[PDB]
C-alpha cells in the first residue's frame, strides 16, 4: 500500500522506481487486494485512499447476479437519474449490494 502511495503520489523518482520494481512480487500479490479510490478529504484537494478488498467480497461482486445488478444500476441512473441524487443513489445501490454479498458470503 505504501509503495503504491509513494508512487502514485510521487512518481518520476528513479530512486523509487528501482525500489518499487524490486518490490514487484509483492505488488502483484496485492493488486487484486488493494482497493483504491478518490475522495475529497477535507483539504479539498483530492486524496486517494487505499484499502483492502476482501477476497470474499471481491469474488462475490463479479459472479452471478450482482453482475446483472450492476448494469441494472447503471441503467437506473443513465436512464432516469438526476444530478443530485446520482451520488445519493449510488450508495443506495451499494448498501443493498453490500448486504447481498454479506448473505452470499455466509452461504
Amino acid at each position: 500500500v505504501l509503495l503504491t502511495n509513494l508512487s502514485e503520489h510521487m512518481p518520476n523518482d528513479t530512486r523509487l522506481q528501482t525500489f518499487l520494481e524490486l518490490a514487484e512480487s509483492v505488488l502483484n500479490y496485492f493488486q487484486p487486494f488493494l482497493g483504491r479510490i478518490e475522495i475529497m478529504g477535507s483539504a479539498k484537494r483530492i486524496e486517494r485512499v487505499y484499502f483492502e478488498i476482501s477476497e470474499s467480497s471481491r469474488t462475490q461482486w463479479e459472479k452471478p447476479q450482482v453482475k446483472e445488478s450492476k448494469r441494472q444500476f447503471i441503467f437506473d441512473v443513465v436512464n432516469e437519474g438526476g444530478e443530485k441524487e446520482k451520488m445519493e443513489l449510488f450508495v443506495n445501490f451499494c448498501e443493498d449490494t453490500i448486504f447481498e454479498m454479506q448473505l452470499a458470503a455466509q452461504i
Partner: protein, 237 residues
C-alpha cells in the same frame, strides 16, 4: 398456490408457464417491449373502444336493416340492432374483420344509403383497421426504439463520462489509452463499493483518519466526498 391446486386438479396446475414473465432472461426483453409503453397502450385501445362505439351509434340509426348474421331472412332473421349486441358486433366482427365491417354485412346494391353506406365503411376500415391498429403496431415498435435508445444512452454516457467524476472521454485521452485506465483504476466503480464495504466492516476506533472522515461524511449523508469534478488527475500536473 397453483401448485397446490395441482394436487386438487392437475389442469390449472399447468398455468405456471407464466413464469416466462420472469423466467428466461432473454424473453423478458420482449415482454418489456410492451409494458414500458403499456400505459399509453391501453388508452389507445381505450380509444378504439370509443371510436368503434361511435360507428355503432351511426349504424344504430342509419343502417339498422343491414345487419344479418342470419341467412337471407328465410331463417328466423336475426337483425342485430340492439345497441348492446350491436356494439358487440362491431367488436367481434368490425374490429376483428381483417377487411372492415362491410365484409360481414348486407353490402349495398342500389340503396339511397349506398353512398352513406360506403362512406361509413370506408372510414371505419381506415380509422379503425388501418390507422388505429397501426398505432398499437407502431406503439410497440416505438417501444423498441424507446428501449434501444436507452441502451444506446448507457453505453454512450458510460464511455463518455466516468461515472463519478463527470469528466468525459476527452480529458483522459491525453494519457495514452487513458480512459480505460481511468475507469478501471482511478474510480472503477466497484472500488467505491468496496471501500464502502471496508468502512462498514470495521469499527470507528479502527478507522484511519481519512476513513474516519469519510465515515462521518457518510453517516451525515453529505456526499461531498465523492469527486465531483476534480478527480485526481485534474487536480494536478
Amino acid at each position: 398456490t397453483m401448485s397446490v391446486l395441482g394436487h386438487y386438479n392437475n389442469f390449472f396446475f399447468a398455468a405456471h408457464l407464466l413464469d416466462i414473465a420472469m423466467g428466461f432472461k432473454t424473453l423478458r426483453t420482449i415482454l418489456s417491449s410492451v409494458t414500458h409503453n403499456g400505459k399509453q397502450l391501453v388508452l389507445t385501445v381505450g380509444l378504439l373502444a370509443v371510436v368503434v362505439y361511435l360507428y355503432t351509434v351511426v349504424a344504430f340509426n342509419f343502417f339498422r336493416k343491414f345487419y344479418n348474421k342470419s341467412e337471407d331472412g328465410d331463417t328466423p332473421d336475426m337483425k342485430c340492432d340492439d345497441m348492446l349486441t350491436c356494439y358487440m358486433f362491431h367488436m367481434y366482427v368490425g374490429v376483428r374483420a381483417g377487411g372492415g365491417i362491410g365484409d360481414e354485412i348486407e353490402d349495398p346494391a342500389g340503396d339511397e344509403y349506398e353512398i352513406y353506406r360506403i362512406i361509413f365503411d370506408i372510414t371505419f376500415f381506415f380509422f379503425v383497421i388501418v390507422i388505429l391498429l397501426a398505432i398499437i403496431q407502431g406503439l410497440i415498435i416505438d417501444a423498441f426504439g424507446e428501449l434501444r435508445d436507452q441502451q444506446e444512452q448507457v453505453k454512450e454516457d458510460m464511455e463518455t463520462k466516468c461515472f463519478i467524476c463527470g469528466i468525459g472521454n476527452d480529458y483522459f485521452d491525453t494519457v495514452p489509452h487513458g480512459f480505460e485506465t481511468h475507469t478501471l483504476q482511478e474510480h472503477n466503480l466497484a472500488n467505491y463499493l468496496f471501500f464502502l464495504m471496508y468502512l462498514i466492516n470495521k469499527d470507528e476506533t479502527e478507522h484511519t483518519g481519512q476513513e474516519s472522515y469519510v465515515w462521518k461524511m457518510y453517516q451525515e449523508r453529505c456526499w461531498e466526498f465523492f469527486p465531483a469534478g476534480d478527480c485526481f488527475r485534474k487536480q494536478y500536473e
